[PDB]
Amino acid sequence: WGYGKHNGPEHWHKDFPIAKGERQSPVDIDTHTAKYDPSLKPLSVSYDQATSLRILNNGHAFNVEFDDSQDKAVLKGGPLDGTYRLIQFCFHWGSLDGQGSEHTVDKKKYAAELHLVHWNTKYGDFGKAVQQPDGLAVLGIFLKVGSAKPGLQKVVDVLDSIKTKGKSADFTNFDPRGLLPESLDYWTYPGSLTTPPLLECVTWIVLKEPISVSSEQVLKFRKLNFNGEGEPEELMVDNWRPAQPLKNRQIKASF
Ligand SMILES: [Zn+2]
């Protein structure tokens, strides 16, 4: 699977038939159709004690891993039940500033999209959480091109060391609080992972308010390679999935 002409999104269903399931992600957020639900609680992010371990190039994106052995970095509140622990964050970007995000707002595409993945501690581990409907909670954050994001520089600076597929680097004392928008107003809906095995275990929480990153920041993203070291160079760009059918599901807004 990949994002090329022969292994792209349109071909995933052959290996992962759930690709055409009933609660696939990402989706287009039609803001006029979204239902304002007064019964939603504010999001509750506790990241002061988060512990990053390292960053890696898995050949389809770059992930920053976190130590989820204890409730150090957790999400609760909102449309959620119980505690969800931060395990990793993944990014998705395009070849141009005009595309990159997975989720779209009234068909508008942002330059990139950041996903903060959390699992339900009721299930004991991440492997068990993905076999459940309320197993995961992903906080989606859009990135628009404008001013630099001070908080993101530490990640940009380390990308050189994880250029190719399989490379990994020690990445400690990285505080994710640096990537949060000012407002925590959100959209919520039941969906799935955006990449295979595309399991329908996710409660999506998409922030209304996007973060701005400089052009030279996102430019460094586009220097990553899909390929392994010693192979033909294939740039990691356009690692995003096209919006999937809503199909009955409803998008609720906390605002
Ligand atoms: Zn992602």
Curated annotation (Swiss-Prot):
Optimum pH is 6-8. Zn(2+) binds at C90, H92, H115. Its main location: cytoplasm. Gene3D superfamilies: Alpha carbonic anhydrase. Changing P197A: Normal CO(2) hydrase activity, but impaired stability. The record marks Y3, N58, N63 as: Fine-tunes the proton-transfer properties of H-64. The active site is at H60 (proton donor/acceptor). Residues 1-255 form the Alpha-carbonic anhydrase domain. GO terms for biological process: angiotensin-activated signaling pathway; carbon dioxide transport; morphogenesis of an epithelium; neuron cellular homeostasis; positive regulation of cellular pH reduction; positive regulation of dipeptide transmembrane transport; positive regulation of synaptic transmission, GABAergic; regulation of chloride transport. Changing A61F: Reduced activity. GO terms for molecular function: arylesterase activity; carbonate dehydratase activity; cyanamide hydratase activity; zinc ion binding. The record marks Q88 as: Involved in the binding of some activators, including histamine and L-histidine. It catalyses: hydrogencarbonate + H(+) = CO2 + H2O; urea = cyanamide + H2O. Substrate binds at T194, T195. Zinc. Can also use cobalt(II) with lower efficiency, but not copper(II), nickel(II) and manganese(II). Changing T194 to S/V: Reduced activity. The modification Phosphoserine is found at S161, S168. Pfam families: Carb_anhydrase. Target of drugs used in treatments against glaucoma disorder and breast cancer. Catalyzes the reversible hydration of carbon dioxide. Can also hydrate cyanamide to urea. Stimulates the chloride-bicarbonate exchange activity of SLC26A6. Essential for bone resorption and osteoclast differentiation. Involved in the regulation of fluid secretion into the anterior chamber of the eye. Contributes to intracellular pH regulation in the duodenal upper villous epithelium during proton-coupled peptide absorption. Belongs to the alpha-carbonic anhydrase family. It is linked to Osteopetrosis, autosomal recessive 3: A rare genetic disease characterized by abnormally dense bone, due to defective resorption of immature bone. Osteopetrosis occurs in two forms: a severe autosomal recessive form occurring in utero, infancy, or childhood, and a benign autosomal dominant form occurring in adolescence or adulthood. Recessive osteopetrosis commonly manifests in early infancy with macrocephaly, feeding difficulties, evolving blindness and deafness, bone marrow failure, severe anemia, and hepatosplenomegaly. This is Carbonic anhydrase 2.
